[model samples]
Target: RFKTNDAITSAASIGKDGTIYFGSDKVYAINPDGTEKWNFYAGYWTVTRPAISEDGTIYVTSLDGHLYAINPDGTEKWRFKTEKRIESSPVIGNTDTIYFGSYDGHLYAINPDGTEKWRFKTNDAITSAASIGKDGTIYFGSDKVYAINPDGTEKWNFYAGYWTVTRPAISEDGTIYVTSLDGHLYAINPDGTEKWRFKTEKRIESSPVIGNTDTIYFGSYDGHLYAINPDGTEKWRFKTNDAITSAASIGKDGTIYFGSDKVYAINPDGTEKWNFYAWTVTRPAISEDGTIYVTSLDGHLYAINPDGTEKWRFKTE
Candidate 1:
């Protein structure tokens, strides 16, 4: 229905009213039927996903080294400056504080109104998004996986010994699953100790997701999407044509969906349910009613039906 002027390398977010938000060189809001609502010139390149607040405020980062707060009408609310480029997607805390990292080696906490709350320095640049724990602990990655207290103090850090580009996925029981460039997925206890490490043939750039049954799903550079048991054992692996750089999203019925050169719908048993052609570069977001929204480097945002057919494809330049 509408097209963006840039490739959408980021994942799309949906608001309570069904407005879809995605970023390319700009941030766009589209109606549920794929008609454009508004677009904001965010940066030279807006590859990071936008985080939408309950009040409809959109938070997005730019490689230009700033985090912008935009109103629902695509107007600027505020912009928070950082020292270096920010690839980390901002996560909203329970108290509405924004948390993200910058290449300058700092994890910053910004108030909802765009004022700085605090910043915690790290040993390296943070390329992944921060995950917030149930108790308000902030978890993120760099050369190591660090957990910071809500007060911006370090609680503990776990050494990955390699750079990590994926965000840490926290389970209901607080198990932190972080993938490293060393070709291993390290499952950490809530206390910052390693529970187990699952090795793959190549590095994992995709983040992991915990299913309703606690099955951990993630993709590897080895061209396989894995379903691992909570005990760190392999449940099964589904092969793909290329590296699965995107995370997996689970449907309400336990269907596992992800993308590589194509969007895949896999059963919980690891069998391929179906596949659709598209260069899916990021994770597919599923609505509560079972519609899967997938973005492709092919310059289209596809809406796939729950039965693995196309519902619609919103063109993006």
Candidate 2:
């Protein structure tokens, strides 16, 4: 329907109206039938995804180290600049506080007035965005997982030793899950303790995505996809023809889909459900109705069916 020149970091629906919004530095909106609604330029590169609030406002980061809020009319409401580039996406807390990180070695909390609520400084760059707990505990990474208070006091820091953790995903029981460059998966408790560590065949960059059964899934640089039980046991795994950098998204029916040079639908028992080649560069996002949204390195965003069939595709660049 519409296209952008920069790499798209995320896609979101505006309200239940299905107004699609996505961008890198340049943001645009599309109507349900693939017609362009509006476009807004940020004057920098934005490879991070946009998080939409319940009121229809969209939040995204820019390469120039700023977080901007786009109004319903596609106009700027406010913006806050960090000390460095925000390479990761921002996660909106349940309390309406905005949490994001920057390459400047800091994790920030921006209040509703666009002023700083609190800032936590770390030893290294904080490319990993912060995730919030049910009780408001902030979990983020800078090679290690740091559990901090909403007022910016450190609760505890669990060191992972060798390599940096770039992506973090949290579960309902306050379990902190993240992947390391050293090819290890870690499960950390709420009080900053190590729960377990699972080794992968090669370097791990893909973020862990959790499902209904506490089933955790991630991809490895070694070109394999793995699913692990809640107790840290391997449920099953599948190999790809190329490096598996994209994260897997589980459909409502329990079918999992991911990408390398192709997209795959795998059964819960580790058997192949179906597969199709599209060559995507990012993780797949599942809709509430079982539609899989993915972006390809070939500059196309594809929607594949749950049974590995094609639904629709749109050019990104």
Candidate 3:
């Protein structure tokens, strides 16, 4: 399907026009035909998913410690340097401000033009991506779960048993479901109080995704994908057969796509719909046509048919 000079372990983000963008040795823009549109040679490396603004500005973080703003044509617009390498992906708030975390223990909010809007300090390195609530509350995890107001003020913080780097899943009811390396998934009420928590065998770094029925879907190091009800009861657990640290992606038709050691497409009821063999290193992308785009530890991107067959493979040098 495509090829790149460097291996890509980062998640690929499709633009409004369907251009796929990801970071490896550089940030690459892949065209519809799987041809390389251009590569923005900013950082020597990155794994953060590139974020796109409303105006098609590509925002990506890197080990070079800069949050780069690349134009739609792959030209550099601006860059905001951080004190330390950034592992968190940049997220665009509803109002278009960009928010992400860095190893410097700060969540920096940048304006559309790449100027610093504000910075919120945390107790540890912030690896979790920022999640913006409906009311403009920004949520991210460091040593704890923090809810920051739009003005960068601390709304409240919820401390799990230990630190978390997994992105928190926000439910419609405003409940923030966050996982911890302490092996527990805690449901934090919007006010920063604990609602309930479900324990697992080991670290639960895999971010959770909420289904339309309020069922929480996430994988654990215990090698199980647990689906929990909103009341914190376990609905079911799909034995993943491997460690899972990546998040699950919900398909348009209610299918659950995720990676453990392989790419799995599971039905909503905790049954396996199908699975593609690959050492998945990133979350699989489901396109409008139901095609699955997944990157593997083999240093390739594969396009799978809706029925779980190989459509094409994108190789790397």
**TM-score of every model versus the real structure:** 0.95, 0.90, 0.94
Q: Once superposed on the true structure, which residue ranges of model 2 sit more than 4 Å away at CA?
A: 1-15
1-317 in candidate 3: lDDT tens per residue? 39643344787777888777877777878765677788888777887889988789999999889999999999999999986888898999959999999888899999998899999987678878989989999998878889999999999988897688888889999999998889888999999999999988798878899994889988898888889999988999888678887888888989998888778889988889998786556777777777777776555767778798987776655
| Candidate 1: tens digits of C-alpha lDDT, residues 34-126 | 888998987777778889898999999987789999999999999999868788888998699999999899999999989999999987788
Compared with the true structure, model 3 gives a TM-score of: 0.94
Ten residues in sequence with the least summed lDDT for candidate 1: 1-10
The predicted structure with the larger lDDT, 1 or 3, is 1
Which digits, one per residue and each the tens of the lDDT, describe model 2 over residues 215-295? 899988878888988788888889888888756878777887788768888877778888877635566766666666666
Report the poorest 10 consecutive residues by lDDT, candidate 2: 6-15
Colliding residue pairs in candidate 3: 1-313
C-alpha lDDT of all candidate models, in order:
0.87, 0.75, 0.85
State the displacement of the C-alpha of residue 224, model 3, in Å, after optimal TM-score superposition. 1.1
